[PDB]
């Protein structure tokens, strides 16, 4: 279902609701659609759960191979491009790359069914519940927002997407990828 | 399953098979009457399924016997062929009967007549014709040995050719072939014909 | 295909139809015999398509003799049966159908019945794979008494056969009933 | 096939049905849907029996063999990776409960290979019928005795309520220190 | 199923397998396939049980009102032709057997509505098998002893060789009057 | 490729004889076969030796010791375990010890014949259990697996090979066999398949349990 | 337009009686609707009827036939023989063969000794010594074969027979999934038609 | 193609509860978060549908137009039998699982095929798995209103979380000796 | 494509964009998706153009037959229900009923593919471009708005729906169904 | 297309048809050699398509002649049947040849032997058997007139029965039927057999 992400004044702020509806019947509610491919970058994912999870583990270990083969943490653009070339080879998932990089402090890549575009001065939204929020969120958008201010946009846009899309979940998880160090955020729920 | 008919000035002769296969794999039922004598001087040789040619043959039989019991004159054989033409064609393409037929007859003006027709209501006047899968076999003979002026009996030798031909190289078909033989006076069967 | 395997106090019994008819259930053969002896204490009764039956019993003939010679002990039924399940599972396609029944002392009697994928039921009592199986479980579920002498168990398994064969068109003539005790083996033909 | 398992105050407690079926007629009075992958971790698969006996065999030996090859008790998540990777290569759900360096973990594994950690789980035809009663009465950190009675309640409901589910029940309390099986919970 | 009929000297005769299985499973072996229509004519159903039974009873009606109408017994070819005329609208093939001519005529009406007249028709799944015996063992007209053994025999081989038919035997020699009736169990000896 | 070993004019394979000499030049281990059990032992500062025992669990039943090259023991033990598993997948039951000894013997055979490889450098002991009975097979580098009521493998075992018999005299009980093993062997390790199928190494404290 | 249900209704003619038992349980493809359904209806007089097809066709078919027996008896002042009942059934059923009723069906009656008519969906009716239909048929018929008939080896005491019915069905619940644990059992002794809710 | 995932009905001697949520998903997603699926044919009778919407309002208008002529009064039984008779006529169709209920007490269900029956408690749609067994678990006769409605509320509680498509708030109706009461409040 | 409607402080305010894209190629741009079934009530329509237009003419003349057969203007609820029962009888269109009625001064019916619900204290939105705006508009909603204030909501929600939905049109038409008399509004365009 | 084989203590006799239809509609090609003498005392009667039975028959011919040129002993006929069994079955269900076969042979221990097999690799030892659509016809005769102890020639009368039967009531099949006749010493053909 929904996955979204808006960059605040500095860093990215990703979000998702968990539901993992299965065959139009909820099966594993309160899962974790958002991911830790690494501390520097997190990767929202939605589509088939199985193909996504396998792909998630796979890009994970490429990310770590790259992580130690060169002691600098891999640029998230490269995480994006490897997911590009990987899912290109059928397998099917849609997903969102956010993270911190010393090369480019905050970006937000978005991989389609097969090929991947960016939105440096924008936001990335996907899933069945995306379509409600593309228009709503692309109105409220302004680039100046700090996390205290954009936390609201993320939170609400999730709430509207979840309101009127059956697949869309209950409990939601968000990450405040701060430009600086740790960026943690805790599961929360409204309606 | 093979049907054959041949016109000349001295004759119309309709040779035809007697077998009738319940299952296509086997000729379980024999000596069937494919012919239908519909006139004093016009036989109808039907083929395909037994039930179609039976329903249709009895049908045409009645409409003609009705037409003749009605008006004084007998149905002129081309009127007979064309009427069978209209009847068989009457069915929408969804429904025509699977019925190959040879009209054959005699006329007070036009004398001997023959009409080759098809499952589709295609029809034409011809000097000879055939039906069934055996059409391909005998036709090169019937074409070859044909005399336009031939006496009837050497034509009977020509059907001997055709038959011994279909036996040797086809769905083998050895049992005797009935065949009505037109004359100025009457038809003349030969069920014994082998 | 029609096969049975009753169990007894000091015995096991196995039985079958002896017809191997073809398409439209024309009886091309009446002497066909699905039961086989893999070992003095081990038997298999095959059913379903007959080609796959000869191929399967053939491969068992192979691998069991191979193991018995390679390892001196006569093979235990649990080994032959779990291995059997291992055998079918490698490919569904190999048997378009086959429904093995395994029977014999191990001197506790051992009765197990594989599915064609190698799904298996290690029963303590009777089991009845075969095209006429429903009539089999039907009669034998209620006719069965826990433990009996080999002859009363014989008339018992014979009543399940005599009952089932007259309800199915594909059921055979005869009955290769095969009561056995560790020291003895008693095959019979019933009409 | 219902299969219900649930975490208690220190040990996973799995419980499952015992009746195979060919689809129309039943083809077994009993079966083992509580396979023992290791002393402090078990799987409870639901689906085709054949595929289940297969992947549980291959799993049991991958895990027992790997345990022989290394010091560590085969911590529960490795079984989940192996299984899900196998199913991902290609029809059989599983529910596995083990206890380890972490908590008494319990997982559910979809036929397409998807994995999820769960507080309590059910799979099969009875799943719905088990989600109804299971969720209603659940509370985190139950006394294990509460697991003992509950999981049997939700199983019995998921038995009586399906044509496809029935027969005697069996339940086990996978403590990290030890499994404690019983062949007939009923 | 399996149906047989042939005419020796003393009359036409009718033989049949009473088994009536719905698929591989056997619904019944008590089933009767032979049916009487007019007091002298009768037919045997083969193929589907419901449609064949329906058409037989229907035939009994049409024939009955005709028989009331002319106050007499109709010729067998009539009773054939009615089914030939109705079935052509749509089942299951059948055999007819009766007395109008000094010899008993025999017929066979296809589900296609094909009508056939002849001396030793047979139908049903196992028809082929007795159908061999009918000329190998009856090239020509014989005796009642010879005939009841014949039909009992040919039915027995159509019983052994075909799993789709079996059950009880039921031969019915037809007198110029009405007919006789005989039923048997297994006769392998 | 090329079998690096080839035959002597004298008919012997000299290379495998070399490996025999290395095993003879390498460390001791004992095996003793009680009427109701089997015991195998061996003579095994910064090094935390607790991780290191020549003893190894191939199954719940089977346990082994090599004498020669430890990495060679590692790979043989690996293939061996993978065979006990390959078998238990191929069939429904635990491997017979004799069968595993045969498969190890073939695996040892090939390298002794197959091209390009140095022959294995070590002997093996393989105590075990089966429905037949409590077992102990030594495997030679040549592929000459052999039954033993007892055995020895490592350095200075010529004199030491003849202390083991005495337990069979009247000490067939395990607890008395223990002395036969340790006193014949006079660090250390001991694995014992007892009346129960599972075996387990005795701790140094339990090594002091018999030291008195 | 057809769903399978397992009404497992069985008939069984005694020496002076007929017995018609049926599991009550209804069920969708794998889920139980009502725990208790009437899979058997009472024809107005000395006979009763059962079925096991889809329940709409069961109910509407029993409705129709009830309307026909009531209309016949009121028009003719005369309670129908069992034969006119089953025959009428062949009539009604074949009248719709091109779109068949899914209800396979059983009749049990007395002629004054339980005359009976089990049959297929299109009215291919047969008399029998005994009858079964529904998904539970194929399993029970051999049990009924032997208990009464001994074709390869006193059979209708009312107690012994109701017992055979009982054990046959109770066993049938076990091996079959569609059969329900409850059973109605009717008994048409010449006096009248008993009902039993044995389960 | 609007659909209503569930309806349930339950009874006790002093009356009969019957409820459903007001959501009306228009395919993948909700359209009407406030649809009225429960409907009142009679002072002592209501119909509750859970399937495609249009068919449901169709049958709604049919049953009403069928009623006003008879408005002793048309019994819930006659209403149910008319209902099933209509489905089965249509079949030889409309997509619903309409249940008739009202008043002594009467509940009847009808599957899409005109399959129909009668029981003390009936659930409809997704509820059957996710509420019925639970409501099969704790159901008891002569539940007082508090016991009963707290019970159905536990059931819809399980349901909204397990059913893929439910609304947070429940239009709800209870039929009493006094007359049918359609409670306005929703949750 | 898009059709929307929000009731201001008193009356309805309907809107639509014209495009009439044909086969994913624009054919008759600047058409008129909104309709005059009558002065009292107007009927937005979207779906297939042909089925809609025919249905539009049909309900028109029923509306006039009812209009003069009883000199009072027909209640718009009845226009709704006749469109309900009509399209019920395959034919396919989705549409929006707004208008004035002395019985009920302002309502907004919404007919689905077949069956029709209302939204008295709400808004009705439909079409391919609807889905963007369901969530956006259902946020900005408040019942107090006058036409000067809600004209903005209509206008903008159209603009967002048209932004990110390809079928959605250019020039847009709106009607301010005033509670009182005439309610006219003129075609307008932004982006 | 019809194949027949019959074992007794005094004989194995394989009667079989000679026709070979290019098109199913017609037996355009005649006198075909369906038999394959694969042994001093074992013939193989193949059927179905001509190309399958030819490729397969030549194939089995070579593997057996190879096996015998190899080991001293001749291939015991059950080993011959089972080997043909393994070969025909070797094909994945996607590929088996459309080939009905009658192994027939003689043995130094087991004497005369017969093996009926199928397009699917189904096989059994029997006293008589048949192939083709004609299996249904002759089998009621072969069952009926069979003597387990019969002299070979009255069996030859039984094939006369079978043949005149298949002529009268089947895909008519009048031309002479070759038939190898096993003896303790040799096979004995009769191509002239009508
Ligand atoms: C769960 C049923 S369900 C509908 O809820 O998923 C059970 C799970 C089960 C049954 N038995 C065991 C043992 C160990 C672990 C799990 C187990 N599975 C089933 O009911 C299967 C239904 C499938 C279609 C979902 N049933 C089967 O697979 C049949 C089992 C069987 C058949 N004959 C037997 C004899 C003895 C013991 C068992 C059996 N067999 C088949 O379906 C045949 N298939 C066909 C295609 O796949 C392989 C074989």
């Amino acid at each position: 279902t929904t996955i979204i992400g808006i960059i605040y004044d500095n860093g990215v702020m990703l979000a998702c609701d968990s539901r993992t509806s299965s065959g139009t019947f909820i099966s594993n509610k309160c899962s974790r659609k958002i991911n830790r491919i690494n501390e520097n970058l997190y990767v929202c994912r939605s589509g088939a759960s199985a193909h996504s999870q396998k792909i998630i583990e796979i890009i994970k270990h490429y990310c770590v191979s790259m992580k130690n083969e060169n002691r600098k943490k891999g640029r998230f653009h490269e995480g994006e491009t490897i997911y590009d070339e990987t899912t290109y080879d059928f397998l099917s998932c849609a997903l969102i790359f956010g993270g911190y990089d010393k090369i480019k402090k905050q970006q937000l890549y978005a991989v389609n069914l097969n090929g991947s575009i960016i939105e440096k001065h924008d936001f990335a939204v996907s899933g069945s519940g995306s379509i409600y929020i593309q228009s709503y969120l692309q109105d409220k958008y302004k680039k100046f927002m700090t996390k205290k201010e954009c936390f609201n946009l993320i939170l609400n846009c999730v709430k509207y997407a979840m309101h009127n899309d059956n697949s869309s979940g209950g409990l939601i998880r968000i990450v405040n990828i701060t430009k600086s160090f740790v960026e943690e955020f805790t599961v929360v729920n409204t309606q | 399953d093979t049907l054959i008919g041949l016109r000349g000035n001295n004759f119309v002769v309709l040779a035809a098979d007697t077998y009738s296969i319940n299952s296509i794999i086997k000729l379980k039922n024999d000596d069937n009457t494919k012919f239908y004598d519909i006139h004093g001087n016009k036989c109808l040789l039907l083929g395909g399924s037994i039930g179609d040619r039976l329903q249709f043959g009895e049908f045409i039989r009645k409409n003609v016997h009705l037409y003749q019991y009605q008006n004084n004159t007998d149905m002129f054989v081309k009127s007979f062929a064309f009427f069978t033409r209209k009847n068989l064609a009457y069915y929408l393409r969804r429904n025509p009967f699977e019925v190959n037929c040879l009209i054959a007859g005699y006329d007070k003006k036009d004398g001997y007549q023959l009409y080759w027709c098809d499952y589709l209501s295609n029809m034409d006047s011809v000097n000879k014709g055939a039906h069934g899968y055996g059409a391909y076999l005998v036709s090169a003979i019937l074409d070859k040995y044909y005399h336009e002026n031939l006496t009837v009996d050497e034509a009977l030798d020509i059907f001997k050719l055709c038959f011994e031909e279909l036996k040797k190289r086809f769905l083998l078909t050895q049992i005797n072939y009935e065949l009505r033989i037109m004359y100025d006076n009457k038809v003349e069967t030969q069920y014994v014909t082998v | 295909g029609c096969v049975l395997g009753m169990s007894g106090s000091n015995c096991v019994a196995i039985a079958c139809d002896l017809r191997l008819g073809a398409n439209t259930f024309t009886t091309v053969s009446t002497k066909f015999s699905k039961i086989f002896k893999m070992n003095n204490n081990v038997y298999v009764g095959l059913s379903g398509l007959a080609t796959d039956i000869q191929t399967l019993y053939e491969i068992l003939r192979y691998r069991v003799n191979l193991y018995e010679v390679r390892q001196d002990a006569e093979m235990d039924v649990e080994c032959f049966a779990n291995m059997l399940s291992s055998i079918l599972y490698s490919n569904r396609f190999s048997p378009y159908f086959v429904n093995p029944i395994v029977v014999g002392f191990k001197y506790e009697p051992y009765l197990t019945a594989y599915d064609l994928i190698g799904a298996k039921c290690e029963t303590r009592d009777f089991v009845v794979n075969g095209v006429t199986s429903e009539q089999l479980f039907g009669m034998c579920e209620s006719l069965y008494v826990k433990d009996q002498d080999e002859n009363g168990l014989f008339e018992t398994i014979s009543q399940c056969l005599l009952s089932a064969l007259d309800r199915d068109c594909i059921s055979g003539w005869g009955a290769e009933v095969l009561v056995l005790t560790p020291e003895k083996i008693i095959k019979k033909k019933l009409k | 096939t219902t299969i219900c398992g649930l975490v208690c105050q220190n040990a996973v407690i799995l419980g499952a049905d015992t009746r195979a079926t060919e689809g129309p007629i039943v083809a077994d009075k009993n079966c083992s849907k509580l396979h023992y992958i290791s002393k402090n971790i078990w799987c409870a698969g639901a689906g085709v029996a054949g595929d289940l006996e297969h992947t549980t065999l291959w799993l049991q030996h991958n895990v027992e063999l790997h345990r022989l090859n290394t010091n560590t008790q085969p911590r529960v998540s490795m079984c989940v990776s192996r299984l899900t990777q196998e199913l991902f290569k290609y029809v059989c759900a599983i529910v596995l409960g083990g206890v380890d360096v972490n908590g008494p973990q319990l997982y559910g594994i979809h036929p397409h290979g998807s994995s999820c950690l769960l507080p309590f789980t059910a799979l099969g035809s009875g799943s719905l019928n088990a989600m109804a009663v299971l969720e209603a009465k659940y509370r985190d950190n139950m006394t294990i005795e509460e697991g003992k009675n509950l999981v049997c309640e939700a199983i019995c409901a998921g038995i009586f309520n399906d044509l496809g589910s029935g027969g005697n029940v069996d339940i086990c309390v996978i403590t990290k220190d030890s499994y404690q099986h019983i062949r007939p919970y009923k | 199923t399996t149906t047989l009929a042939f005419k020796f000297k003393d009359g036409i005769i009718v033989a049949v397998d009473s088994r009536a299985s719905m698929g591989s499973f056997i619904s019944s072996q008590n089933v009767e396939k032979i049916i009487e229509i007019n007091k002298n004519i009768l037919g045997t159903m083969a193929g589907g049980a419901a449609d064949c039974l329906y058409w037989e009873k229907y035939l009994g009606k049409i024939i009955k009102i005709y028989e009331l109408r002319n106050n007499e017994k109709i010729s067998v070819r009539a009773a054939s032709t009615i089914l030939s005329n109705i079935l052509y609208q749509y089942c299951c093939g059948i055999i007819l057997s009766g007395y109008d001519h000094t010899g008993f005529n025999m017929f066979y009406v296809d589900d296609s509505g094909k009508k056939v007249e002849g001396n030793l028709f047979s139908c049903g799944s196992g028809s082929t098998y007795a159908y061999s015996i009918l000329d190998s063992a009856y090239d020509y007209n014989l005796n009642l002893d010879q005939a009841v053994e014949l039909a009992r025999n040919a039915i027995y081989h159509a019983t052994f060789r075909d799993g789709g038919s079996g059950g009880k035997v039921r031969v019915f020699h037809i007198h110029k009057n009405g007919y006789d009736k005989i039923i048997e169990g297994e006769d392998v000896f | 490729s090329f079998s690096l070993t080839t035959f002597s004019p004298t008919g012997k394979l000299v290379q495998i004889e070399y490996a025999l000499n290395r095993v003879s030049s390498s460390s001791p281990a004992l095996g003793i076969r009680a009427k109701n059990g089997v015991i195998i032992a061996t003579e095994k500062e910064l090094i935390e030796e607790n991780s290191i025992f020549k003893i190894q669990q191939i199954s719940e039943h089977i346990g082994i010791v090599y004498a020669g090259m430890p990495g060679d023991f590692r790979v043989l033990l690996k293939r061996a375990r993978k065979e006990a598993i390959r078998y238990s997948l191929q069939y429904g039951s635990e491997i017979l010890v004799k069968e595993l000894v045969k498969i190890i013997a073939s695996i040892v055979q090939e390298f002794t014949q197959t091209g390009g490889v140095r022959p294995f450098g070590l002997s093996l002991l393989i105590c075990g259990v089966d429905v037949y009975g409590y077992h102990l097979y030594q495997i030679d580098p040549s592929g000459c697996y052999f039954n033993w009521m007892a055995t020895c493998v490592g350095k200075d075992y010529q004199n030491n090979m003849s202390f083991l018999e005495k337990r069979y005299n009247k000490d067939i009980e395990i607890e008395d066999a223990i002395h036969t093993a340790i006193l014949t062997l006079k660090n250390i390790e001991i694995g014992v398949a007892y009346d129960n199928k599972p075996f387990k190494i005795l701790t140094q404290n339990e090594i002091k349990d018999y030291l008195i | 337009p057809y769903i399978d249900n397992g009404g497992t209704v069985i008939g069984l003619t005694g020496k002076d009686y007929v017995i018609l038992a049926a599991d009550t349980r209804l069920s969708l493809s794998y889920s139980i609707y009502t725990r208790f359904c009437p899979k058997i209806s009472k024809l107005t007089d000395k006979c009763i009827i059962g079925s096991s097809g889809m329940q709409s066709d069961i109910k509407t078919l029993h409705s129709l036939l009830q309307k026909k027996i009531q209309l016949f008896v009121l028009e003719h002042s005369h309670y129908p023989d069992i034969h006119v009942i089953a025959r009428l059934l062949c009539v009604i059923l074949y009248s719709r063969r091109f779109f068949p009723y899914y209800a396979f069906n059983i009749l049990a009656g007395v002629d004054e000794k339980g005359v009976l008519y089990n049959y297929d969906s299109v009215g291919s009716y047969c008399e029998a010594t005994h009858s079964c239909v529904g998904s539970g048929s194929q399993l029970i018929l051999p049990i009924l074969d032997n208990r009464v008939e001994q074709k390869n080896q006193t059979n209708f005491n009312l107690g012994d027979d109701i017992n055979f019915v009982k054990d046959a069905i109770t066993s049938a619940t076990e091996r079959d999934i569609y059969t329900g644990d409850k059973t109605l059992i009717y008994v048409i002794d010449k006096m009248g038609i008993n009902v039993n809710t044995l389960d | 193609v609007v659909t209503g995932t569930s309806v349930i009905a339950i009874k006790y001697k002093h009356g009969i509860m019957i409820a459903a949520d007001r959501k009306a998903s228009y395919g993948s997603y909700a359209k009407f978060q406030n649809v009225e699926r429960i409907f009142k044919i009679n002072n002592k009778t209501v119909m509750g549908f859970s399937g495609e919407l249009a068919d449901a309002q169709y049958l709604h208008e049919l049953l009403t137009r069928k009623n006003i002529n008879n408005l002793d009064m048309y019994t819930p039984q006659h209403y149910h039998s008319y209902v099933s008779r209509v489905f089965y006529v249509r079949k030889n169709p409309l997509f619903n699982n309409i249940i008739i209920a009202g008043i002594d007490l009467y509940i009847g269900f009808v599957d899409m095929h005109g399959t129909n029956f009668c029981d003390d408690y009936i659930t409809t749609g997704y509820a059957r798995y996710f509420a019925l067994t639970l409501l099969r678990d704790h159901y008891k006769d002569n539940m007082t209103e508090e016991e009963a409605r707290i019970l159905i509320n536990e059931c819809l509680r399980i349901l909204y979380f397990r059913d893929a498509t439910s609304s947070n708030f429940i239009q709800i109706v209870k039929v009493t000796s006094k007359g049918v009461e359609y409670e306005e409040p929703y949750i």
Side-chain angles (χ1 to χ4, degrees), chain D residues 152 154-159 162-167 169-176 178-182 184:
Chain D
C152 183
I155 288 297
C156 290
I159 280 175
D162 282 346
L163 301 179
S165 298
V169 187
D170 54 345
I171 305 170
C172 53
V173 53
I174 296 95
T175 53
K176 56 182 179 66
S178 63
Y179 65 102
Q180 285 301 315
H181 198 57
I182 56 173

Side-chain angles (χ1 to χ4, degrees), chain C residues 113 115-117 119-121 129, chain D residues 1 20-22 27 31-33 35 45-49 52 124-125:
Chain C
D115 180 7
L116 60 83
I117 195 170
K120 175 170 171 287
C121 190
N129 291 344
Chain D
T1 299
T21 303
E22 187 181 1
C31 52
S32 296
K33 287 176 293 303
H35 296 284
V48 180
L52 201 155
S125 68

Side-chain angles (χ1 to χ4, degrees), chain E residues 1-21 23 25-26 28-29 31 33-35 37 39-52 54-65 68 75-76 78-84 86-87 89-101 103-110 112-113 116 118-138 141-151 153-169 171-180 182-189:
Chain E
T1 62
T2 291
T3 59
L4 280 62
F6 60 85
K7 182 178 179 292
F8 61 95
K9 298 308 288 182
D10 301 341
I12 191 161
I13 86 167
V14 183
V16 71
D17 283 341
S18 291
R19 176 180 296 183
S21 67
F25 181 81
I26 292 171
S28 177
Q29 289 175 335
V31 296
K33 310 292 295 192
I34 308 303
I35 290 173
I37 299 99
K39 179 177 174 290
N40 192 334
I41 197 176
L42 61 79
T44 187
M45 59 167 278
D51 52 359
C52 273
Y54 179 78
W55 294 99
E56 293 296 319
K57 299 293 183 291
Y58 176 80
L59 182 65
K61 182 178 72 70
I62 306 301
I63 292 300
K64 183 52 162 57
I65 303 166
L68 294 175
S75 68
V76 181
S80 298
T81 306
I82 300 304
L83 295 177
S84 297
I86 312 305
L87 258 66
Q89 166 164 5
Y90 296 124
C91 293
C92 61
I94 65 171
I95 294 172
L96 291 172
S97 298
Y99 177 75
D100 47 339
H101 302 291
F104 302 75
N105 277 344
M106 183 183 294
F107 294 91
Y108 178 77
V109 179
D110 290 345
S112 179
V116 187
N119 290 335
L120 54 90
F121 293 110
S122 297
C123 53
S125 70
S127 68
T128 67
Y129 294 103
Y131 181 75
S132 293
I133 314 302
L134 291 175
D135 277 343
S136 297
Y138 170 70
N141 283 340
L142 292 165
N143 292 335
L144 184 67
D145 301 338
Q146 184 70 56
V148 65
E149 181 175 4
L150 173 59
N153 185 332
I155 281 182
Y156 172 65
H157 290 84
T159 293
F160 180 92
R161 294 296 308 186
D162 191 11
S165 66
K168 297 175 300 299
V169 188
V171 295
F172 297 93
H173 306 299
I174 286 180
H175 189 207
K176 290 181 290 292
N177 302 348
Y179 65 95
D180 284 342
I182 287 180
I183 179 169
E184 296 178 353
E186 180 181 3
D187 57 346
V188 179
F189 298 169

Side-chain angles (χ1 to χ4, degrees), chain F residues 3-11 13-16 18-20 108-109 111-114 119 140-144:
Chain F
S3 289
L4 268 63
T5 184
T6 55
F7 295 92
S8 306
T10 59
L13 289 173
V14 179
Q15 292 296 320
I16 305 167
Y18 293 157
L20 298 172
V108 177
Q109 176 60 252
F111 292 0
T112 61
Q113 187 176 359
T114 56
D140 193 72
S142 300
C144 293

Side-chain angles (χ1 to χ4, degrees), chain B residues 20 22-23 26-27 30-36:
Chain B
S20 57
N22 184 337
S23 298
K26 67 171 181 177
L27 293 165
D30 290 342
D31 294 349
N32 191 336
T33 304
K34 297 183 175 180
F35 296 87
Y36 294 86

Side-chain angles (χ1 to χ4, degrees), chain A residues 11-12 25 32 40 42 49 63 79 81 88 94 107-108 111 114 124 130-131 147 155 163 166 186:
Chain A
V12 190
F25 170 81
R32 291 169 183 76
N40 67 341
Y42 288 72
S49 298
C63 183
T81 300
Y88 180 77
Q107 298 284 317
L108 181 60
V111 181
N114 297 333
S130 65
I131 190 162
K147 68 187 188 70
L155 182 73
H163 180 64
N166 292 291
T186 57

